[PDB]
Design a protein around this ligand. Sequence first.
Ligand SMILES: CCCCCC(=O)Oc1ccc([N+](=O)[O-])cc1
Ligand SMILES: CCCCCC(=O)O
Length: 309
Amino acid sequence: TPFIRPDMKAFLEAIAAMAGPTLAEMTLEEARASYVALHGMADRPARELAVIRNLSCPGPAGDIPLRLYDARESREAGPVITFYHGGGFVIGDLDTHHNLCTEIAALMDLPVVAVDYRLAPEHPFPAAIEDCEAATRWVASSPSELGRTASGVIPIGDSAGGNATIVVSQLLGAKPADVPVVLQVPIFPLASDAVGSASLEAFAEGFVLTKASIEFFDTAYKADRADPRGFPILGDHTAAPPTIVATASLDPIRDSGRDYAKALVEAGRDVVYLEMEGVTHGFTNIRAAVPSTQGDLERIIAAMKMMLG
Ligand SMILES: CCCCCC(=O)Oc1ccc([N+](=O)[O-])cc1
Ligand SMILES: CCCCCC(=O)O
């Protein structure tokens, strides 16, 4: 059996005892609500911040809702973190990842702008990518409504948001925004197709993220397997920005993150590869129920500070 931390194992046992339905067996809104409750009841509370503000920016389909987080009411020009939540491009929103966002803002002492991108199945691929890209370009333009000047942007996101992180970095690499991507932080990302990977078969059931859920998300989102906006392992890595890839050792899509970090090394790019041992997919948002995952997040934070200077 693979190594599992005792506090992680207790959380897995609680999930197994619940013996709930699969995402596909729920209504779509029930699936979304189950994720709100999962993070809501497992994550640490939000940090108190000087600024937590709802706003929006123009997007190709209409306005994109955003949430700004800042430990400071006023700050000089500097990098701005642009965050994209996980949930397979089907579930999650600004609230499911709100507490994590306040934690990133507090521990980095940088502003964080989270993106409420359009979701599948209502908006299939590449809708989420369109909104993540547009919001990141908007932040990079230092708009007056943001009240903070950006010298650079830092794409960051978990799971599907880690997919969006890499895609955004690739799109902005090809057609620059007003300032560069100075660092990207894909956290347990889907970069290569997980079908056929060893991790997907090893951790198909019992590790929070399941093969069944991955399939449910894929059917709703409908990413083209040949399109680098769906599977950014296919993109051009030769000018990838400085990168931190964080994975979990018990994650069915762990090997997708391994693949991406190896491709960056193969292309000669600077990359920090951190594989958190004995925890699952989603460890960034279960920091109360599994207290050791707070330390995993702090390691990501420390690597970010180092890679930023
Ligand atoms: C209830 C568990 C499902 C949500 C898991 C999650 O926290 O976020 C994910 C984001 C994207 C992908 N994916 O790209 O297959 C899988 C998982
Ligand atoms: C709040 C989650 C729904 C996505 C926001 C949107 O469709 O623009």
